[PDB]
Symmetry: D6
Subunit: 166 residues, 12 copies
């Protein structure tokens, strides 16, 4: 039961990395070039795009992927230098759990579960409130939901192993 | 008879991967930049493109290709860790069959068998119904048909081997 | 006499692959962006480009190159698994001959021997007949002729070897 | 206590390099193409962009990363040629400390801690003072703060080891 | 005297390949996008660009570089299969000489020694004669002269060795 | 004293190559697209850009870097074929010195020490004198000064070693 | 009672003529230049304007004013030539009554009682239905109502006099 | 005292007519052509102009001028036909008083005492509220105030004479 | 019976003159400014407008009106100079009849009975056949029919009087 | 001496009226259409034109001309009704003097003695200060000076006659 | 025979004046606004229009009409002052004949008998020869022919009377 | 001899007035709308037009015509009031002579004898010197020469009469 858990954790991690690396950089390529607002005021598109999308999804996901692999690198560097291992194993498992729960919660609080097609903006230099229009909202919603599901699976598996060792 | 089946399955898989990887990313590059509607309303092109092409073909095909190769990776990781194999062989064959039938059915239900040159749109902020025009419809239809044929071949071969073991 | 034939077949194949891979992808890059028609009708450029160039030359050539190398891959995979060879040699030679004659005939029937600078279009939504103008016709004609010559050489050589074994 | 310090220094360095190399080149790609000023004067955008952003952040960070790794390369080349080592160790540690403090101070003096959305320009050929608008200010502020934090960590660690040897 | 000739021939060949491969593809990138004619007629720019630059310099140089390295590949493939060598050496030297003289003569007859800044065009659909303007003529002239000089050196060296063996 | 000189020469050479290879190709990417002149005459921008920047800095630097590494390649090829060495060492040192002094002098005579923001042009088809505006002048001035400093260091070191052997 | 009726009929007629002659020609001056439709199709504005306003109000009113004054001119010309008068008086009164009732009914059937701000058009070459926008609708509605009121007064007065003579 | 009142009434009336007739038609000529709103929506300018200026000042003033001269025309036509006069004098004086008070009150209720430079509009097809800009507001305010003053003088004089007869 | 004929002829003539003089010059004012063709060719609008409307209706009608009043002017000038009259009366009646029949026939042969909304043009410099769109076709058709009716009435009356004298 | 004064006063008045009436309305016709500011802000041209030219010169001059002729009209109407004259003569002379001095002073205080070619504007919605450019400044300055000279002559003459009667 | 000649001369003169005065000013109104050349050079339209139409037809015709009526005015002024007449009659007849023959010859030499639709221009600043397109050529040709016919009639009549007196 | 001089003076004056009044106002109508300069600087067209044409020809001619008729008006007003005449005759003749010589000299000094097609401008805000292009230069030159000739004739005649009285 604990044998397969490691195999599936490794497979899930590699699957997530591959999905992010091969296709995600090209859904977001035209994010700002196809963003448009109904206005004649210079500079309003810049302010409204910046307010609607402060940090792009793909940047957040790359950062999370890199940060959740640091304890393994630390353990490897330690063992390489060696040339209390069990204490290091315990601590790195604890740290990985904490990091993955923090990142999932932050994703939920930053983005939610959908990307709408319209946005209402009231930032200077825009006069009163203006209406703006988003590029590719459905594909981005699908990507959001898929990433949340994968990260949930990973959280479940790591809690499984944590309780297995105890 | 069962000897050649493995060889042809491997050759078909590699052929499909090569065709998708080398040329497909450059037919779809201008999909939205050359999409145009007969209108003077800001934001109508975005909504109508999003409604006509919710998920691009190339994204779906990359996802399918990656997902149909996961049982092999699991089997490899298991055997590497080992350093009931036959039960694993049976189960992974079953899973591969199921995954490939599901993906073929989903392709048929999402896209059909042709890409038309005109599209009729009635989404806000467009006033009533508008007419829009697609880029490269014939090449995309050819690509659709070719991919369906290859996936059908793969389904047939996997059912062949499933019935061979029994 | 039969000794040099293999050497020249290998050299011709590699030469063709190199020419296609290094330069051909950048002659066709601006094919649709520099295509223009004399009209004020929205959507006419898309329809007329699609009717003039249904499948681009470079796509056809990549497909042909990949498909004419499949019998070798099959033979290699068979011999690797082995770890009636002569029957396989005979059959793969026959298949290669057939495939290369089919592809050369199809090229002639799809494209002919020249690319003209003007095109006359009568597809909806264009009103009556309109005149359109092509990008880089002379270079594309040179490329067409060169590829036909190379494929003819390959056909001759394979028939040579077929008659050598008999 | 001195054992883990080396491991964490190596991990911090690699983390910083990865973050800069994978994502940073694509936040700054549209820096000048989406810079706009409220004016009808030709040449004012060029002068005002040049005055607002004399050296781009990403250029400065690449230069710093390369320059802080030179003492290690020198030590490696020396030891390779050898085929007073401790004196070289002392000197290279001193030099690394000095270089990293200089670069952090220079960053603070060149850029500060935020990127504002508006800029006020009074350079020829602009008539009197004009108002200009920046692209992606929030993401760039986040990047600035993150890089300062990482470099501070590195400074602390190197002072730690310097005082450890004494 | 014959010892150094081989060394310098190899060095000249590698130098030419490096110069062509690293920088030449980016001088010609904007060749047609920055070509402009004084006219209001649709389609005149396409015809006049095609008449002024039938085959681009960089295509011709890549083709020549690849074609002048084929005898070496043939000799290598022959010797590999072997696992009258002197007759092959003689013949391949003769062929290389002929190929390089033909390519140099063709360059002179196709392009000459300079690229002018103005071009006079009288092709349909242009009305009478029109004036057009070229991008980056001085850099292209420098490149032309450099390539002619290198190819002349190579011709001299190969004739040297031909007369050395006799 | 002569021991460290080799180490620092190697380190300086590698540093220069890295700086040129990683960042320099992307400062100059928009050199002509953001060049603008105050005029309504077609073709004036092309002529004035060509007169202001006959050969781009990055082309000159790549050429110099490649040409100053040829004597080493010659020496390596000679020693490989061998499988009067000191005479070759002397001669290649002399040649490297000469080449580096020539390239530094040529840089000074071609470009000077700064890139101004305005340029005054009087070339046909421009009527009388017109005013044009440059992109990113400050960054290009910084790059110029840095490259001059590095090349000066290299000249000093090579003269050092020349006088060391005598 | 019959004495004042003539005075008020003359005053009403002159008032109507003055109102039409002095101001009405300048409300309708920009009728077609400020008519606009939401479309990119050439020729749609012409067809939709023609369908919305077949005959302009001011043309109809001028025609009516001229046609209702013809019996008086006939009577004057007859009396001038004379140099059964009562029969002519009776007949011209009858004719004036008939003409004014016909013109009022026709106005009601052609135009109604209001001018709306939006118009829905489905005429070739417009694709399906389009939305168009009118200039100065409120002023035109006020003018319509005023003219109907005046013509009603005139009808009442002429019936009064008709019944007075009997 | 009653002698001069008639003279000044006649002079005031003629002065008002002259001011309206000679200059007023050319202040309002560009009223709609120089009206502009900050928006990209087709048809918003028409709706907002119509809502801001339902009836133009000059139309109202022409109508008032014509309507306040009708009792005199009636009296003249009566006396001409005659070829109880005092009763007619009394009645026409009463009617003139009433008409002029009504028109002054209506002016105050329709327009007020100033024309502002900005207008806030919320009419379909405009999205939410938009800002629009008026042409020549100061001159129009001056004209408004002048006309109110003149009409007040006329009211005072007519009440004077009414109380004089009693 | 012959008494009223003169009265009605005079009334019809004056009515026709008034209708032409007051309103007709302002229906045709925008005839060429609102004429548009679907094309990108310079000069095609001029040629197609000239071919569709060689002589404008209003010019033809003014010419006809002036030419049908010349015999009266001749008779008046003769009688004024006098200060065989019946022979002059006969001849001028004959001439008026002939002139009016000729002008009516010419109108029918030049214009017909309707003005269509579309026109098909094949004149140089237009490429093949193009489609063009007319301004105000319905109003112009109404005007055509009205003018034909009036001229028919005049013809009938003049034949009446011709047969009356005999 | 007093005899000629009346003749010259009448001639000066008529000359001024003719100059204003025949040419002045066509210098000012394009006053706002050729007014332009260096800005991209919608509505700034309207505000800056309104602030630079609150009341146009030609309006002020027409008003002054009409107002300085009212005492004569009053005197004429009085004498016509008569069908103490000297008291009326005295009073009207006094009033004319006062009116002409007031109008000359007001002209000086409103406009000064020149019209500059540049104007500096700081009114909302313009951001900070902008530069604007005037149409036909020299002709307008000449007109200003001429009108001041004529009005001065008239003032002198009226004071002459005032002191003549005493 | 000589009696009717005067009557017809007077009628022809009045007819010509009426035709020129009522319609001719509105055929030529858009002469330069609808003149267009195929070029991108600023100022070419002005030069080519000026070279194609140095003096407009309508200016020449007005001048001729005014100049051919001067002898009558002279004779009238002489006879009015009188309050050798036959000598004046003779001389003015001679002068009128001469003036009308000169004007007809000049018309033929300036304009010919047709107005073509295309014009070929080679004036600075136009580069080489350009093609331009004329407005309303057919109507202008008709006008030309009509005016020549009328002037010929007048010449014939005046020679008739000259020979009548002798 | 002195009898005809008055007749010809009156005829010349009336001829000049008619030529100026009927046609001259419509040659100059588009003077500034068709004035264009080769530049991208806002405001340069205004400054250069103002510097090229400070006072338009037609304004100068109207002013001169009005000012040369003032002595006659003075003489008429004097004689009307009378209801030393010879002294007035002498003085007005002297004044007319002086005025006409002054105006002719001023014309020569202001305008010269031709209107060129090109103008060279160096006024702020134009950068250095720019080239501008004039509308209708040939017609304006013809008008200039004609007006000079007429004014010369008038000068000659007035000197004739001056010397006749003595
Ligand atoms: O990708 C382009 C390229 C590749 C290659 C190959 F893949 F064969 F090595 N060869 C190139 C050649 C060559 F002549 F075929 F070597 C010329 C120009 C660009 C080449 C260049 C290579 C250098 C870096 C810039 N792109
Ligand atoms: O209205 C313009 C005009 C009018 C008058 C006037 F009202 F005094 F008679 N004078 C004009 C003059 C004149 F020199 F003052 F006579 C010149 C040019 C145009 C004039 C011209 C007159 C002729 C027909 C075209 N408009």
């Amino acid at each position: 039961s604990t044998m397969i858990g490691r195999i599936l954790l490794t497979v899930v991690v590699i699957f997530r990395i591959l999905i992010v690396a091969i296709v995600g950089e090209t859904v977001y390529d035209d994010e700002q070039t196809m963003f448009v607002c109904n206005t004649l005021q210079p500079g309003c598109n810049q302010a409204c795009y910046d307010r609607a999308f402060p940090i792009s999804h793909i940047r957040y996901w790359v950062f999370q992927i890199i940060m959740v692999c640091t304890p393994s690198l630390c353990f490897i560097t330690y063992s390489v230098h060696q040339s209390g291992i069990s204490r290091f194993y315990i601590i790195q498992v604890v740290f990985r759990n904490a990091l993955e729960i923090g990142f999932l919660v932050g994703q939920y609080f930053l983005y939610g579960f959908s990307v709408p097609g319209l946005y209402e903006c009231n930032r200077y230099p825009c006069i009163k409130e203006v209406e703006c229009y988003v590029s590719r909202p459905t594909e981005k919603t699908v990507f959001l939901v898929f990433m949340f599901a994968v990260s949930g699976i990973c959280v479940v598996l790591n809690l499984a192993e944590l309780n297995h060792l105890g």
